[PDB]
Write a protein that holds these residues in place. Structure first.
Motif, PDB file in Angstrom:
ATOM      1  N   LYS B 497       0.835  -1.224   0.000  1.00 58.31           N
ATOM      2  CA  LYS B 497       0.000   0.000   0.000  1.00 58.31           C
ATOM      3  C   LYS B 497       0.865   1.268   0.000  1.00 58.31           C
ATOM      4  O   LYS B 497       0.509   2.268  -0.625  1.00 58.31           O
ATOM      5  CB  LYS B 497      -0.992   0.023   1.182  1.00 58.31           C
ATOM      6  N   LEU B 498       2.017   1.194   0.665  1.00 58.90           N
ATOM      7  CA  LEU B 498       2.904   2.350   0.882  1.00 58.90           C
ATOM      8  C   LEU B 498       3.381   2.953  -0.421  1.00 58.90           C
ATOM      9  O   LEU B 498       3.345   4.167  -0.631  1.00 58.90           O
ATOM     10  CB  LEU B 498       4.139   1.920   1.672  1.00 58.90           C
ATOM     11  N   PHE B 499       3.868   2.072  -1.276  1.00 55.43           N
ATOM     12  CA  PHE B 499       4.386   2.449  -2.573  1.00 55.43           C
ATOM     13  C   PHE B 499       3.258   2.845  -3.518  1.00 55.43           C
ATOM     14  O   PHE B 499       3.468   3.589  -4.477  1.00 55.43           O
ATOM     15  CB  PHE B 499       5.194   1.290  -3.147  1.00 55.43           C
ATOM     16  N   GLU B 500       2.057   2.355  -3.234  1.00 59.44           N
ATOM     17  CA  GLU B 500       0.893   2.693  -4.047  1.00 59.44           C
ATOM     18  C   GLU B 500       0.351   4.086  -3.746  1.00 59.44           C
ATOM     19  O   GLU B 500      -0.346   4.656  -4.579  1.00 59.44           O
ATOM     20  CB  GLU B 500      -0.214   1.640  -3.908  1.00 59.44           C
ATOM     21  N   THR B 501       0.683   4.645  -2.584  1.00 54.62           N
ATOM     22  CA  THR B 501       0.052   5.901  -2.142  1.00 54.62           C
ATOM     23  C   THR B 501       1.003   7.048  -1.791  1.00 54.62           C
ATOM     24  O   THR B 501       0.852   8.134  -2.340  1.00 54.62           O
ATOM     25  CB  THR B 501      -0.929   5.664  -0.983  1.00 54.62           C
ATOM     26  N   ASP B 502       1.960   6.840  -0.887  1.00 53.77           N
ATOM     27  CA  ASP B 502       2.865   7.941  -0.523  1.00 53.77           C
ATOM     28  C   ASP B 502       3.746   8.344  -1.699  1.00 53.77           C
ATOM     29  O   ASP B 502       4.422   7.518  -2.314  1.00 53.77           O
ATOM     30  CB  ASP B 502       3.753   7.640   0.695  1.00 53.77           C
ATOM     31  N   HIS B 503       3.779   9.645  -1.945  1.00 52.96           N
ATOM     32  CA  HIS B 503       4.460  10.208  -3.099  1.00 52.96           C
ATOM     33  C   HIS B 503       6.011  10.189  -2.976  1.00 52.96           C
ATOM     34  O   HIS B 503       6.708  10.276  -3.991  1.00 52.96           O
ATOM     35  CB  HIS B 503       3.882  11.607  -3.376  1.00 52.96           C
ATOM     36  N   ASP B 504       6.537  10.052  -1.754  1.00 54.64           N
ATOM     37  CA  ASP B 504       8.005   9.910  -1.511  1.00 54.64           C
ATOM     38  C   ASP B 504       8.438   8.454  -1.571  1.00 54.64           C
ATOM     39  O   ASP B 504       9.610   8.144  -1.804  1.00 54.64           O
ATOM     40  CB  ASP B 504       8.430  10.436  -0.133  1.00 54.64           C
ATOM     41  N   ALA B 505       7.501   7.570  -1.267  1.00 54.73           N
ATOM     42  CA  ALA B 505       7.709   6.148  -1.477  1.00 54.73           C
ATOM     43  C   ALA B 505       7.722   5.890  -2.980  1.00 54.73           C
ATOM     44  O   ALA B 505       8.705   5.369  -3.508  1.00 54.73           O
ATOM     45  CB  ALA B 505       6.617   5.337  -0.798  1.00 54.73           C
ATOM     46  N   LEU B 508      10.824   6.808  -4.112  1.00 56.50           N
ATOM     47  CA  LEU B 508      11.905   5.888  -3.741  1.00 56.50           C
ATOM     48  C   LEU B 508      12.013   4.718  -4.704  1.00 56.50           C
ATOM     49  O   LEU B 508      13.107   4.329  -5.093  1.00 56.50           O
ATOM     50  CB  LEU B 508      11.703   5.322  -2.338  1.00 56.50           C
ATOM     51  N   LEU B 509      10.876   4.109  -5.017  1.00 59.80           N
ATOM     52  CA  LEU B 509      10.842   3.035  -6.006  1.00 59.80           C
ATOM     53  C   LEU B 509      11.487   3.549  -7.279  1.00 59.80           C
ATOM     54  O   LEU B 509      12.465   2.985  -7.762  1.00 59.80           O
ATOM     55  CB  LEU B 509       9.406   2.597  -6.306  1.00 59.80           C
ATOM     56  N   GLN B 510      10.961   4.661  -7.785  1.00 56.14           N
ATOM     57  CA  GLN B 510      11.435   5.212  -9.054  1.00 56.14           C
ATOM     58  C   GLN B 510      12.919   5.550  -8.931  1.00 56.14           C
ATOM     59  O   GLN B 510      13.577   5.760  -9.933  1.00 56.14           O
ATOM     60  CB  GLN B 510      10.607   6.429  -9.524  1.00 56.14           C
ATOM     61  N   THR B 511      13.430   5.577  -7.699  1.00 55.63           N
ATOM     62  CA  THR B 511      14.875   5.700  -7.417  1.00 55.63           C
ATOM     63  C   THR B 511      15.626   4.383  -7.538  1.00 55.63           C
ATOM     64  O   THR B 511      16.742   4.346  -8.034  1.00 55.63           O
ATOM     65  CB  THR B 511      15.137   6.208  -5.982  1.00 55.63           C
ATOM     66  N   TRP B 512      15.041   3.316  -7.016  1.00 53.45           N
ATOM     67  CA  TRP B 512      15.619   1.989  -7.176  1.00 53.45           C
ATOM     68  C   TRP B 512      15.557   1.549  -8.614  1.00 53.45           C
ATOM     69  O   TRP B 512      16.566   1.114  -9.165  1.00 53.45           O
ATOM     70  CB  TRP B 512      14.853   0.962  -6.371  1.00 53.45           C
ATOM     71  N   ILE B 513      14.356   1.612  -9.198  1.00 57.38           N
ATOM     72  CA  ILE B 513      14.174   1.272 -10.614  1.00 57.38           C
ATOM     73  C   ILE B 513      15.279   2.028 -11.329  1.00 57.38           C
ATOM     74  O   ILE B 513      16.160   1.435 -11.948  1.00 57.38           O
ATOM     75  CB  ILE B 513      12.806   1.712 -11.228  1.00 57.38           C
ATOM     76  N   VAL B 521      12.960  -4.300  -6.794  1.00 60.67           N
ATOM     77  CA  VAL B 521      11.842  -4.225  -7.724  1.00 60.67           C
ATOM     78  C   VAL B 521      11.137  -5.579  -7.814  1.00 60.67           C
ATOM     79  O   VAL B 521       9.915  -5.672  -7.686  1.00 60.67           O
ATOM     80  CB  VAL B 521      12.327  -3.808  -9.122  1.00 60.67           C
ATOM     81  N   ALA B 522      11.925  -6.619  -8.054  1.00 65.64           N
ATOM     82  CA  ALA B 522      11.423  -7.986  -8.064  1.00 65.64           C
ATOM     83  C   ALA B 522      10.644  -8.332  -6.791  1.00 65.64           C
ATOM     84  O   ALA B 522       9.570  -8.918  -6.878  1.00 65.64           O
ATOM     85  CB  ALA B 522      12.567  -8.959  -8.265  1.00 65.64           C
ATOM     86  N   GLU B 523      11.178  -7.982  -5.616  1.00 70.71           N
ATOM     87  CA  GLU B 523      10.438  -8.195  -4.348  1.00 70.71           C
ATOM     88  C   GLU B 523       9.028  -7.652  -4.497  1.00 70.71           C
ATOM     89  O   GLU B 523       8.048  -8.320  -4.177  1.00 70.71           O
ATOM     90  CB  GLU B 523      11.046  -7.440  -3.151  1.00 70.71           C
ATOM     91  N   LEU B 524       8.953  -6.394  -4.910  1.00 71.28           N
ATOM     92  CA  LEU B 524       7.712  -5.637  -4.845  1.00 71.28           C
ATOM     93  C   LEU B 524       6.735  -6.109  -5.894  1.00 71.28           C
ATOM     94  O   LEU B 524       5.536  -6.243  -5.628  1.00 71.28           O
ATOM     95  CB  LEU B 524       7.983  -4.149  -5.044  1.00 71.28           C
ATOM     96  N   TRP B 525       7.255  -6.349  -7.090  1.00 66.87           N
ATOM     97  CA  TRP B 525       6.421  -6.819  -8.183  1.00 66.87           C
ATOM     98  C   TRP B 525       5.660  -8.075  -7.788  1.00 66.87           C
ATOM     99  O   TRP B 525       4.443  -8.127  -7.960  1.00 66.87           O
ATOM    100  CB  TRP B 525       7.230  -7.085  -9.448  1.00 66.87           C
ATOM    101  N   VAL B 526       6.351  -9.080  -7.249  1.00 66.48           N
ATOM    102  CA  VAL B 526       5.654 -10.340  -6.922  1.00 66.48           C
ATOM    103  C   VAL B 526       4.506 -10.115  -5.928  1.00 66.48           C
ATOM    104  O   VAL B 526       3.456 -10.758  -6.028  1.00 66.48           O
ATOM    105  CB  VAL B 526       6.579 -11.487  -6.446  1.00 66.48           C
ATOM    106  N   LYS B 527       4.696  -9.160  -5.018  1.00 69.43           N
ATOM    107  CA  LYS B 527       3.708  -8.849  -3.978  1.00 69.43           C
ATOM    108  C   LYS B 527       2.504  -8.101  -4.531  1.00 69.43           C
ATOM    109  O   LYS B 527       1.477  -7.962  -3.860  1.00 69.43           O
ATOM    110  CB  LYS B 527       4.368  -8.059  -2.847  1.00 69.43           C
ATOM    111  N   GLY B 528       2.640  -7.611  -5.756  1.00 69.12           N
ATOM    112  CA  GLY B 528       1.507  -7.042  -6.480  1.00 69.12           C
ATOM    113  C   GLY B 528       1.716  -5.639  -7.013  1.00 69.12           C
ATOM    114  O   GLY B 528       0.838  -5.107  -7.693  1.00 69.12           O
ATOM    115  N   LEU B 529       2.870  -5.041  -6.726  1.00 68.22           N
ATOM    116  CA  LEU B 529       3.125  -3.670  -7.158  1.00 68.22           C
ATOM    117  C   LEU B 529       3.235  -3.574  -8.670  1.00 68.22           C
ATOM    118  O   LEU B 529       3.880  -4.399  -9.330  1.00 68.22           O
ATOM    119  CB  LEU B 529       4.370  -3.066  -6.495  1.00 68.22           C
TER     120      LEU B 529
END
Lengths: 553, 560
Positions: B497-505, B508-513, B521-529
């Motif tokens: 939910k965190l990455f789906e809503t908070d604009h700094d999260a 952060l993703l767009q920082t890792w990507i 990224v792989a962690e998050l994708w499998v979980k549904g992101l």
């Protein structure tokens, strides 16, 4: 560019042909009946065709044995199909080797099932095989929309010059109770036995039976070849519902995209559209969706109100299914030809789920003149939407002493024709007699049993047919069976001074002599009969097929 | 202009798919068998054909995948069900998924000529068969079923070609499907003297008896070449000319017409500026039929001879020798053969040929039977070209001309059920195993962008064919300590939910990507992101490629 329709034939509940169809439409007759037990025991409404078992196999060089094996759907279309060509003024000789495409709407193999060479593929192919056509021959099952989808594809192939003529058509029969079970179980049909089109009592539809054909060509070629032209097709299109709430639910979005994409592509302004033959199956949730979808698209271009009439011939004749589109296209063309709109039936109270008042559309329930502003040609749409989800919509625009010969393959029929022409001339007070005789000459194949005569008046013409009929005329009617009279004509077929003598009589308008010879089997170049002024081909009645009964063996 | 084929799927006797098909073709395998009694008792009816090219497991379907109630599946013609599957897979082959396909003007043109299964019963119209796929994936092109008998799938191909060219649709799915479920069908064909007693389509042979029925299902995704190059699809071939027509009046409705074949073939080349010399192979109708074969041959030969004196330069062949007469599916199986030959620059054997048909002399012909596995050679830098023919017993014929086309990663998979996800993994393993030269970036790009992310997921990194395979093995054996990630999406909504809503999260993703931190990224994708896979690529983007497609549950459905 545009696509001329140059010939038609039709057979619907309570209409043996296109004429009777138009009489019924004007007299707002309802053709729905109870299903007798000749068909099947209901231990209940259907728009029915009479005598579906009837076929003239010999005419089509089919062995009567094989006819019992043929789906009557194949047999009936084969007939109407043939007649449609004859309507346009074409015969086998003329049709031989034509790149004529056949596109045949068809959605049931009931009769093949009851059997305990019946493919769709063959159904289509019968006609090309018979008349040696070379256009592709294709059967279309898009269910309800089949005949209009075929119309579209025929349009495209002509435009793209892959074919030079097209025969489109549709055919539906309901032979088994199993078919109704299917539809009743899925909540499609009306308990009232009516397609209450646009009505707030809209229950469901009532099944219809039917068979119809259209001959189509490129408008350029049609004007050039001097065919008669019922109308022209100025735009067509097809598409899909997509994912709807159930496979057989309609999609307003698809209807709008379809209708909008067409007008946009073909520069058509909804204001120009004065009538629309709707799909309008008289269906609870279907009707209002169709209405809104169209209304809206119209409203995107124009604030004008109550200017487009709407109607559905399913109110008159039921849901003719594969034949629906073609019966609707025919309705419209006939309205155009007579500059006359006619009633859609079963309408007392407007569908509650649509408010007409602020709509570009109005239900038209009255027989009335179809008026147009300026010198602006009438235009109308026909819609057809499948329970499979493939939709089709087209837009038509309105267009702008003689020697009488007949022949047939059997004497019994030659008489029947004669009876046909009499009733036709009787009923049409204004016929151009030159046109008619020209059509009988050049627009019909000269078959083995012939008769001919001269006339310079509608009166004299009728009293010739009467005389022939009980055979008691003053004396001036020729009649022969061609196979008994080969030697009475060999001379003109071979000697070059005889050939030259004929061309002298023909050239000298000596018609009694030409008529003598023609009936006996002589081939007459009918063109040498006309110098500066040539007449026009017209719609006349077509071959009155033997009414011989064929069913399961 | 031209029409790119950008995706395919197929299922024929002895090929579960297009790849197995091509292996068989190269090893000149014959897939004709005796008809077991699981199908029907041949002994009960036999009297002087007991042969058929068959599909296995025709009763198998994954209804839940297509949101169909298993109850309704028993009522479905298996012809509908199988095509629904191959149809779907053809899209997946091309790299397309539902999301991408939603609302596309995609026309479906479905070859089909039998309702056998509806007859044994007592939503099985041809009309519906076609419609299944548009309904499922929300396509908006017309959906139309074609019964021109034998030629059905090639006629649909022509009509699809025309609608694309005329810009009425932007994509097309063409295909065909034939099954032979009842003995009644063979009675029909045996009684009319169509089939071989030998159970063979002895194509071009002077022992040509008749044909042997084939079963089949095939699909092609088509687009306008301009759009295909633009959208960076992979392209098997292009269609440079097509046409259709009729026999007309022939000696019996089901007799062929040499004159119609010639007019058809001649009109095409003339219209599309094709010179028969340029044509090196022709997949013939070639049903192995007594009088049909020599007519087809002469007709083509003659048309070729009207433009060229050259001799023995055009190979000919019929895959019906390999797999029988696949009927409605014939044209599409033939188009597929050809495209595969093109892709491998390899011609292959047509079977059952010992002695040339007596009624045609090859020696002075532009054509020759090719019976040998060999390189498909071309002069200059001139692209290969071939024709496919198909002619109906109804009399509606079709002919097309194809021309060859000359142009650490993060691996994700998903499926609707865990059992299948494993199956998918087994599929990719066997695929990578068998393809030594795979571009690993291309592949992972395809898995990312060309496949719908379904509920059960797994992912991993690899920079080598070796490391990739070991990953799949580990996942399969269940062992890595490890590398691999794997989740069921519905149990893991709050971990994301965190990455789906908070604009700094999100940032952060767009920082890792953006910073190529792929384990995360792989962690998050499998979980549904939902991962915008494009941000993974800057200057150089990879290409979509043909990979194996959804391994549908193999659940059995038949009469209720």
């Amino acid at each position: 560019d545009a696509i001329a329709i140059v010939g038609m034939s039709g057979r619907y509940p309570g209409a043996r042909n296109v004429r009777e169809y138009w009489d019924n439409l004007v007299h707002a007759r309802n053709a729905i009946r109870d299903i007798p037990t000749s068909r099947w025991d209901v231990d209940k409404s259907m728009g029915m065709l009479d005598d579906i078992e009837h076929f003239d196999p010999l005419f089509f060089n089919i062995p009567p044995s094989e006819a019992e094996l043929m789906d009557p759907q194949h047999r009936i279309f084969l007939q109407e199909g043939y007649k449609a060509f004859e309507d346009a003024g074409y015969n086998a000789r003329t049709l031989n080797e034509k790149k004529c495409g056949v596109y045949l709407g068809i959605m049931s193999n009931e009769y093949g099932v009851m059997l305990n060479g019946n493919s769709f593929a063959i159904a289509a192919a019968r006609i090309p095989y018979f008349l040696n056509l070379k256009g592709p021959a294709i059967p279309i099952d898009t269910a309800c929309s089949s005949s209009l989808v075929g119309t579209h594809l025929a349009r495209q192939a002509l435009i793209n010059k892959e074919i030079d003529m097209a025969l489109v058509g549709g055919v539906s029969l309901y032979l088994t109770p199993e078919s109704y079970m299917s539809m009743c179980e899925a909540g499609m049909l009306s308990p009232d036995g009516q397609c209450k089109a646009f009505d707030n009592g809209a229950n469901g539809f009532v099944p219809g039976e039917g068979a119809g054909a259209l001959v189509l060509k490129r408008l350029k070629d049609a004007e050039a070849d001097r065919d008669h032209i019922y109308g022209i097709i100025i735009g067509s299109g097809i598409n899909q519902d997509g994912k709807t709430n159930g496979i057989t639910a309609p999609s307003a979005k698809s209807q709008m995209d379809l209708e909008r994409d067409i007008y946009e592509t073909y520069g058509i302004h909804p204001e120009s559209i004065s009538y629309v033959e709707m799909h309008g199956t008289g269906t609870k949730q279907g009707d209002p969706i169709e209405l809104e979808a169209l209304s809206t698209v119209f409203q995107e271009k124009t604030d004008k109100k109550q200017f487009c009439a709407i109607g559905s011939v399913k109110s008159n004749i039921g849901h003719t299914s594969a034949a629906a589109g073609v019966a609707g296209v025919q309705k419209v063309l006939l309205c155009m030809n007579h500059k006359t709109l006619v009633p859609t039936l079963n309408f007392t109270t407007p569908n509650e789920h649509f408010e007409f008042e602020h709509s570009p559309l109005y239900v038209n329930t009255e027989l009335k003149p179809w008026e147009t502003a300026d010198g602006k040609p009438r235009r109308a749409c026909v819609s057809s939407f499948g329970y499979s989800g493939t939709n089709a919509h087209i837009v038509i625009e309105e267009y702008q002493s003689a020697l009488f010969v007949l022949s047939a393959k059997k004497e019994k029929q030659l008489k029947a024709y004669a009876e046909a022409m009499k009733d036709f001339v009787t009923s049409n007070e204004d016929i151009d007699l030159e046109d008619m005789a020209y059509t009988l000459q050049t627009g019909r194949e000269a078959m083995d049993y012939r008769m001919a005569f001269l006339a310079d008046s509608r009166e004299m013409l009728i009293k010739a047919l009467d005389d022939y009929l009980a055979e008691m005329p003053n004396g001036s009617i020729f009649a022969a069976h061609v196979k008994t009279k080969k030697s009475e004509i060999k001379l003109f077929e071979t000697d070059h001074d005889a050939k030259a003598l004929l061309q002298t009589w023909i050239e000298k308008k000596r018609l009694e002599k030409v008529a003598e010879l023609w009936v006996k089997g002589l081939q007459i170049d009918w063109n040498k009969l006309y110098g500066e002024y040539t007449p026009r081909r017209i719609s006349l009645p077509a071959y009155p097929f033997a009414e011989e009964y064929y069913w399961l063996p």
